[PDB]
Each structure stands twice: as structure tokens, then as C-alpha cells.
Amino acid sequence: IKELKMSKDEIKREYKEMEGSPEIKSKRRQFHQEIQSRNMRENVKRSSVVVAN
Amino acid sequence: PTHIAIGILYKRGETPLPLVTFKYTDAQVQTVRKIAEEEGVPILQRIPLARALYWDALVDHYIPAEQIEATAEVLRWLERQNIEKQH
Numbered sequence: 209i210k211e212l213k214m215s216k217d218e219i220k221r222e223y224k225e226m227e228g229s230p231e232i233k234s235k236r237r238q239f240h241q242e243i244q245s246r247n248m249r250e251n252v253k254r255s256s257v258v259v260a261n
Numbered sequence: 262p263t264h265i266a267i268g269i270l271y272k273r274g275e276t277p278l279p280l281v282t283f284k285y286t287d288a289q290v291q292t293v294r295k296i297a298e299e300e301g302v303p304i305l306q307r308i309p310l311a312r313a314l315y316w317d318a319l320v321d322h323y324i325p326a327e328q329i330e331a332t333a334e335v336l337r338w339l340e341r342q343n344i345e346k347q348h
């Protein structure tokens with residue numbers, strides 16, 4: 209039988225559809241939150257004092 | 262904001278003037294509080310100064326002149342607590 213072939217365009221379209229997935233968007237946000245948490249710990253360690261209201 | 266937490270760095274002979282290290286508001290303030298307790302970084306309630314630094318202060322810049330007098334009191338308090346804790 210004739211061999212199936214995914215065009216470069218089909219691959220981009222399938223991937224953009226995947227990026228639109230709620231689970232996949234949620235994991236991106238989760239990753240950003242983990243970098244913000246890491247940065248928060250480093251910011252605090254670099255400080256002499258914290259002033260709060 | 263409702264809640265404010267602002268980090269200040271000042272080490273004599275290292276920083277010529279005090280530096281703003283972070284600015285957090287609201288939900289992030291309880292997290293900042295936990296990490297500061299865990300890391301042994303003092304957290305002081307100074308409502309006028311925290312409110313003033315919220316408006317004017319820029320992260321990784323020096324404390325602005327408009328807040329240096331109020332900041333110097335906090336820094337002199339922190340130095341007194343440090344020297345006294347050594348006893």
C-alpha cells in the first residue's frame with residue numbers, strides 16, 4: 209500500500225491544536241509558577257530584611 | 262494591593278546604599294512570609310514605609326531618597342537586634 213506521509217504543514221497544525229489543549233496550557237502555567245517560586249526563595253535569601261504592611 | 266512585602270539588602274562595605282531585592286503583593290505575601298521564616302530573614306511590619314516603597318521602589322535599584330530616612334530606622338533596628346542576639 210501507498211505510504212502515509214505527514215507534510216510539514218500537518219505536523220505544525222497537529223502541534224498548534226495540542227498547544228490549545230486545556231491540560232497542556234495548565235502544565236505551562238504550572239511550570240511558570242515553579243520558576244516564580246524558585247525566584248521568590250532566591251530573592252528572600254539575598255535580603256537583609258522584609259518590610260510588610 | 263491588600264498585602265505588601267518588600268525585600269531590602271544592606272551589607273556595610275558591600276552595598277554603598279541599601280538595595281530593593283523584591284516586591285510582592287497579596288497572595289504571594291503569605292509565601293514570602295513562610296520562606297523568610299525558613300531562611301532566617303527578619304520580617305518587620307512598617308505599614309507607612311511598605312506602602313511608600315510599593316509606589317516608588319524599583320527592584321534591584323537603591324532605596325529611593327524619599328524613603329531612606331524611614332529605611333535607616335529599620336536598618337539601625339536590625340543592626341541593634343543582631344548585636345543583642347549575639348548575647
Ligand SMILES: COC(=O)Cc1nc(-c2ccccc2)sc1C
Binds near residue numbers: 271277278330331334
Ligand atoms: C536617617 O539617616 C540619615 O541621616 C540619612 C542618610 N542615610 C544614608 C544611608 C546610606 C547608607 C546606608 C544607610 C543609610 S545616606 C543619608 C543622607
Ligand SMILES: [Cl-]
Ligand atoms: Cl534553601
Ligand code: NA
Binds near residue numbers: 283284
Ligand atoms: Na519581584
